[PDB]
Design an enzyme around this catalytic site. Structure first.
Site, PDB file in Angstrom:
ATOM      1  N   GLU A   1       0.862  -1.247   0.078  1.00 49.81           N
ATOM      2  CA  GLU A   1      -0.044  -0.107  -0.075  1.00 49.81           C
ATOM      3  C   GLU A   1       0.884   1.501   0.066  1.00 49.81           C
ATOM      4  O   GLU A   1       1.870   1.277   0.917  1.00 49.81           O
ATOM      5  CB  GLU A   1      -0.986  -0.030   1.119  1.00 49.81           C
ATOM      6  CG  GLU A   1      -1.781   1.017   1.453  1.00 49.81           C
ATOM      7  CD  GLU A   1      -2.550   1.155   2.665  1.00 49.81           C
ATOM      8  OE1 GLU A   1      -2.822   0.083   3.342  1.00 49.81           O
ATOM      9  OE2 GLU A   1      -3.113   2.170   3.082  1.00 49.81           O
TER      10      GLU A   1
ATOM     11  N   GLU B   1      -3.699  10.904   3.120  1.00 48.09           N
ATOM     12  CA  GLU B   1      -4.641  10.487   4.303  1.00 48.09           C
ATOM     13  C   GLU B   1      -4.478  11.714   5.309  1.00 48.09           C
ATOM     14  O   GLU B   1      -3.832  11.944   5.846  1.00 48.09           O
ATOM     15  CB  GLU B   1      -3.882   9.179   4.756  1.00 48.09           C
ATOM     16  CG  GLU B   1      -4.903   8.577   6.002  1.00 48.09           C
ATOM     17  CD  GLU B   1      -4.606   7.221   6.427  1.00 48.09           C
ATOM     18  OE1 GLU B   1      -3.462   6.968   6.693  1.00 48.09           O
ATOM     19  OE2 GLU B   1      -5.564   6.676   6.474  1.00 48.09           O
TER      20      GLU B   1
END
Ligand SMILES: [Mg+2]
Ligand code: NA
Ligand code: NA
Ligand code: NA
Ligand code: NA
EC number: 3.2.1.81
Lengths: 295, 297
Positions: free
Chosen positions: A126, A131
């Site tokens: 990932e 974020e």
């Protein structure tokens, strides 16, 4: 024009950056419950399997749409439940290093995560380009939320799935902070995924972080092709697997049910907060993807 | 000039320098063939990296390697009551991984047998050949001049799928280096900079002779895919990522002792007359040195 903007990463000697046609500036209409062909050639309006998400998240196809030049995505309470329905889309084509990927996005004024990220098909690797938990304030915790409103989490994970294990860098530089309150404007969040052992993060065209080498990418050898998690053996792969591009919002467990049990450290939208739709609408003006090629 | 003072020809990079690794060996001890002793055995096992006894007519033997007079030495003799040839093979007790520069000072045998310094992953899927050379001036088995091969050094890498068996290596002309030198006349330095899983540089006598870089040459068939090996529509390739044993040996290879063509004129393996010259079938390695790039303080 979005293609006039220089890419800030270095393509290499006698190399240039080539625009990839899977890029999208969302200058079409795609109704939430009937997306249409333009959207669907490049995007699926769900997560890459039938998982409906973490914490209180329940992803829904009809919580994403495109209008007025932007991919948009919003959150509403699931009727009769604590869950929150929310958007999630995934690219129909995968990307791999070397590649520069950059989204022009406006972090929500919400305790929910605003996310642009990459995930391998087998869920073991990932890369998180953006974020961010952008709310000025949290009613759930009853506090000023500027600790989070001024931070962008820029990271990557390697996983073992069989028994679940999760590694990411945890040093302070993985949370970038300027003084900028991210929810106020569209910013550019990019990553140069150069090779399996080297990531560079760019915000508004500026290098803010370099994650390079084995010791920080996978110190626990979770990417060993043989016997993951065993540091006596080195068959590490690094971030080598092709990845889906994912744009979503998320209620995450560490926030809605914090380890401490305290309401004071619980950051998730109340119903009153959900009644302001713009505050819980994540906007992406565009996402552009370049590959380095020979001149 | 001292083996540790010779500059490493690969470029460590910006703000880096080359750090000598202690697993290097200049073989300045004694290690009897049938009783190697503790100095040899701290760094080396005197066999292959598993119990397999080699290809073709090869039958590897612990007691066909030794160290004396400042050299690792390795020789070939006919197996009693057989066509097979007993010969040496040793492997390192520690593995190496990119980024790493590895260089052997070695004298290729005046023999149809292969003189080899190479790297091989534990699971046998990934291989880097620093030196693979067939050095004889002549082959009495073939009844012809052997200078086609005596002037060539094979520098290559393999990636394998074990089941079902598939073998990829680069086959372009540059994988056989030739400048007129007859490799069997002198000790030369043969090295590789294994920089990352997608980049190799080969150095002979301190000079860059070949660069093998990029996915299209290292693993174009996707044999190193983590899922669905050989499927080129899916890209999970790892390249040459796996740590490797260092192996130094000689070999009779099947493509030489029983060629595809079935012809004696393409059959290159030692006769009894040729094996009777011991020096011609003795591979000598003066030293092998290993460096890793580290950040300058
Ligand atoms: Mg000569
Ligand atoms: Na700029
Ligand atoms: Na747009
Ligand atoms: Na010798
Ligand atoms: Na020596």
């Amino acid at each position: 024009d979005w293609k006039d903007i220089p890419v800030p990463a270095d393509a290499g000697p006698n190399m240039k950056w080539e625009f990839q046609e899977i890029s999208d500036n969302f200058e079409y209409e795609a109704p939430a419950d009937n997306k249409g062909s333009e959207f669907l050639e490049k995007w699926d309006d769900f997560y890459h399997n039938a998982w409906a998400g973490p914490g209180l998240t329940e992803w829904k196809r009809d919580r994403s749409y495109v209008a007025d030049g932007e991919l948009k995505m919003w959150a509403t309470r699931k009727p009769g439940s604590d869950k929150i329905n929310m958007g999630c889309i995934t690219s129909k084509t995968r990307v791999v290093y070397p590649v520069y990927i950059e989204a022009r996005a406006k972090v929500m004024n919400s305790t929910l995560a605003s996310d642009v990220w990459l995930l391998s098909a087998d869920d073991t690797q990932e890369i998180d380009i953006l974020e961010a938990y952008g709310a000025d304030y949290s009613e759930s915790a009853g506090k000023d939320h500027s600790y989070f409103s001024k931070k962008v989490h820029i990271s990557h994970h390697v996983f073992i799935r069989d028994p679940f294990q999760d590694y990411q860098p945890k040093d302070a530089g993985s949370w970038f902070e300027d003084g900028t309150v991210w929810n106020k404007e569209f910013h550019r969040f990019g990553v140069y995924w150069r090779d399996p052992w080297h990531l560079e993060y760019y915000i508004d065209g500026v290098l803010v972080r370099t994650v390079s080498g084995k010791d920080i990418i996978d110190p626990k050898h979770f990417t060993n092709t043989t016997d993951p998690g065993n540091t006596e053996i080195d068959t590490r792969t690094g971030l080598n697997k092709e990845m889906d591009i994912i744009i979503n919002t998320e209620d995450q467990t560490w926030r809605s049910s914090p380890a401490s049990g305290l309401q004071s450290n619980t950051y998730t939208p109340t119903d009153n907060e959900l009644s302001n739709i713009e505050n819980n609408t994540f906007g992406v003006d565009w996402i552009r993807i370049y590959k380095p090629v020979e001149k």
